[PDB]
Write a protein that binds this ligand. Structure first.
Ligand code: TSV
Ligand code: ZN
Length: 198
């Protein structure tokens, strides 16, 4: 009945993929109990750093990537949810189910990637375990893994970036193309589609 209707929680930043140095590594900044509480309140006072965040809801964990001052992720992870922030829940500024794309204003302290203008097809996918996987671009929204991986390896990395050699954002990881559970290719949201959305 109306009085007892629940609301979905916020997406919560729970860590980040550190790409600053010469070693890439995943860092957790909030544990599960704190994530649960922050999802309910929508109030997150933790400091945010870096370009790739690890994000969670009550039921899923995935990635989100800052590009041109917007924190982007996949709709199949975030739905229409708010994101937790120091001042309470923040509403999505972009929602596009047709593109499997959402975005919120980038949190204070994040750093943004620049959209790629290189026209280059040698790419790199960053996973939630901070693996940096070479990917050859094969079309507007597809690329092949140079070394195939079981899909287990890629699960939870949607919302992460594909980058060019120079570290520009080329796209947002959306889906794995798998045969018999082995991913030989990935599908991504091209950065130009984000740029049009903006
Ligand atoms: C499209 C094609 C060629 C048929 O392929 C596939 O459908 N294959 C599957 C293989 C799944 C096995 C695991 C693969 C491992 C990792 C995958 C990256 C990943 C992920 O980590 N999600 S998550 O755990 O973080 C999760 C917590 C956030 N995404 C998925 O699972 C997505 C979700 C779902 O697809 C979608 O709802 N949309 C809506 C779209 C709108 C436009 C364009 C698109 F393409 C769209 C795809 C199926 N997905 C695949 O990948
Ligand atoms: Zn580039």
């Amino acid at each position: 009945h109306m009085a007892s209707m629940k609301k979905k929680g916020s997406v919560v930043i729970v860590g980040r993929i550190n790409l600053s140095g010469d070693t890439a590594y995943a860092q957790q900044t909030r544990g599960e109990e704190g994530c649960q509480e922050t999802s309910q309140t929508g109030r997150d006072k933790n400091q945010v750093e870096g370009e790739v965040q690890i994000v969670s809801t009550a039921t899923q964990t995935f990635l989100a990537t800052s590009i041109n001052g917007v924190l982007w992720t996949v709709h199949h992870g975030a739905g229409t949810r708010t994101i937790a922030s120091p001042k309470g829940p923040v509403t999505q500024m972009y929602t596009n189910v047709d593109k499997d794309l959402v975005g919120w204003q980038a949190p204070q302290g994040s750093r943004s990637l620049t959209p790629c203008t290189c026209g280059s097809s040698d790419l790199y996918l960053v996973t939630r375990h901070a693996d940096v996987i070479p990917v050859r671009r094969r079309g507007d929204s597809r690329g092949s893994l140079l070394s195939p991986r079981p899909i287990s390896y890629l699960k939870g990395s949607s919302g992460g970036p594909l980058l060019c050699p120079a570290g520009h954002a080329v796209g947002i990881f959306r889906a794995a193309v798998s045969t018999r559970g082995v991913a030989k290719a990935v599908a991504f949201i091209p950065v130009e589609s984000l740029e049009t959305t903006m």
